[PDB]
Write a protein that binds this ligand. Structure first.
Ligand SMILES: C[C@H](O)[C@H](O)[C@H]1CNc2nc(N)[nH]c(=O)c2N1
Ligand SMILES: C[C@H](O)[C@H](O)[C@H]1CNc2nc(N)[nH]c(=O)c2N1
Ligand SMILES: N[C@@H](Cc1cccs1)C(=O)O
Ligand SMILES: N[C@@H](Cc1cccs1)C(=O)O
Ligand SMILES: [Fe+2]
Ligand SMILES: [Fe+2]
Lengths: 307, 307
């Protein structure tokens, strides 16, 4: 089996092995070419590389343009959440607002955010230079660690970015990580991925993608978005609930092998019977991943136990 | 029911509510009268009072006399452990020696000790000014927190002290707290005590006293000491295994109501069939303590959940 981390400190081993969605040379996303943007990303990358388990996440200062982007993103999404975001999400957001500083004119500092999550569900942030492989990100959820970015998307296209910027992490992921049920849900699938065969991790990731990332669900006689990827892009947040996208019932045996895109709006979304049913399905599947052993995380010593 | 702490930070509420065994005006223990001793204790008390959850335990410097006391205590007990200490204890001690600095000429710093315990079983130290009530100390074990003292016994009588000095904490308690089975054992009885009726807490304490504090057990065709109170006093460590003390089989229905002393060697010890049987008995009893609810500690958020 593939070597997996046993300690929360061993995350650094595979930590900062950043990747990309290959949208650089994409004429659809000129921002990446911005030399100022790249230098900025180089600065945040160094903070992630000079970071090690234990220390508090270094606080930083953002440019005028970066604050503007967050202001546009934040104020636009907040207006969409009222009619597009699922119930669970909308009842948690206010907490971040009054207890974490989530505001139109204030980009939250990761340290404060990580502290907020610790007292909520035990989750904690870990600054990373960029995109991580599904295996590493998923593995980190076993320790209730969320590898999070500090840089913000290019101000030219605040409606959507193919990369997982700070807007995506904080506005799409953090909110549900402060929920106990969702937090334990996230850790379980993360534990199942540990040392799991590559073929199952990718199936897992695909399911994660069509649920946690771009999942859709119907509450009552309506339909809302619950996926981080939808909750952080006011661009396709409008689109995921229009008539353009194709909708299908959530079915693991079909969703696990479905194709998706990483540099554009999804042409297809899976609708779950409910946010709850969505979690039920993933767990069952996750608990189906074969492997020559079992594992258990010890929250006291912060280590993985191989049964 | 009595108000009990829900958070590991709420320990400070009832923290530093130090007490005493009333051995001050005792002509058997002149040390307490030493004005130098008292001033010293006043200094360690201030560190405990100016301490708050989170911060690392302040490192201190000890006097020549204090180092001498620790040297005498340590080197004498280490020689007795070989034939008096139980198996579990003797196989753990070496770890503290090479990984924590437990040496004849080096009084361990609480911070390093607390760090060592975190990586072992999740336990952590919390500096206190002196003796705590059974209810508070026991309650702290629910969060895997061990309220520990920094001062050392008076150099005039290193063979025995009625107070729980640093020698008692580190040489008698810390070693077994680094054991997983014993660590979970300690936390369980601590959880049972939370909000429990006063009458049961005192019965619990009495049992704790005749087991964790001065418990004796027979491994193979021999008998060893496993109680913290015996493992930290080379004075009655010799005595608990001589013929002077009275020995009786460990029986909760009889041990729970037995009388004991706090300023002298115990005139009676209870022998368990084995260190393992000792734990079994206490747990069962602890799980017998009635109360209009149930509780569960969440290691992720570090809070008590009232079922
Ligand atoms: C597991 C799945 O691939 C998911 O999209 C992961 C991938 N890598 C990531 N990397 C970082 N830094 N942040 C994320 O939110 C993600 N999402
Ligand atoms: C629970 C039982 O009373 C036990 O002897 C406790 C009492 N108070 C204590 N207080 C401190 N500071 N340290 C200890 O080891 C103890 N032992
Ligand atoms: N496209 C999303 C970001 C990501 C979704 C999934 C991975 S990154 C948005 O612009 O916020
Ligand atoms: N009498 C023990 C100390 C304590 C035992 C029980 C509470 S304090 C010794 O001298 O180390
Ligand atoms: Fe994501
Ligand atoms: Fe003790």
């Amino acid at each position: 089996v593939p070597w997996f981390p046993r300690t929360i400190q061993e995350l650094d081993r595979f930590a900062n092995q950043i990747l990309s969605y290959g949208a650089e040379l994409d004429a659809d996303h000129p921002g990446f070419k911005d030399p100022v943007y790249r230098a900025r990303r180089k600065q945040f990358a160094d903070i992630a590389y000079n970071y090690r388990h234990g220390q508090p996440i270094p606080r930083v200062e953002y440019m005028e343009e970066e604050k503007k982007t967050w202001g546009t993103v934040f104020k636009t999404l907040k207006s969409l959440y009222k009619t597009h975001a699922c119930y669970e999400y909308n009842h948690i957001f206010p907490l971040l607002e009054k207890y974490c500083g989530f505001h139109e004119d204030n980009i939250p500092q990761l340290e404060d955010v990580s502290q907020f999550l610790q007292t909520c569900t035990g989750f904690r942030l870990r600054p990373v230079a960029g995109l991580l492989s599904s295996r590493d990100f998923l593995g980190g959820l076993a320790f209730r660690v969320f590898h999070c970015t500090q840089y913000i998307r290019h101000g030219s296209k605040p409606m959507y970015t193919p990369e997982p910027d700070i807007c995506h992490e904080l506005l799409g992921h953090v909110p549900l990580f402060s929920d106990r049920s969702f937090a334990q849900f996230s850790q379980e699938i993360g534990l199942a991925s540990l040392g799991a065969p590559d073929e199952y991790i990718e199936k897992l990731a695909t399911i994660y993608w069509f649920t946690v990332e771009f999942g859709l669900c119907k509450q009552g006689d309506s339909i809302k978005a619950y996926g981080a990827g939808l909750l952080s892009s006011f661009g396709e947040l409008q689109y995921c609930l229009s008539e353009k996208p194709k909708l299908l019932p959530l079915e693991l045996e079909k969703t696990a092998i479905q194709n998706y895109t990483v540099t554009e709006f999804q042409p297809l979304y899976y609708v779950a019977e409910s946010f709850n049913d969505a979690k039920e399905k993933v767990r069952n599947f996750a608990a189906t991943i074969p492997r020559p052993f079992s594992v258990r995380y010890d929250p006291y010593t912060q280590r993985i136990e191989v049964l």
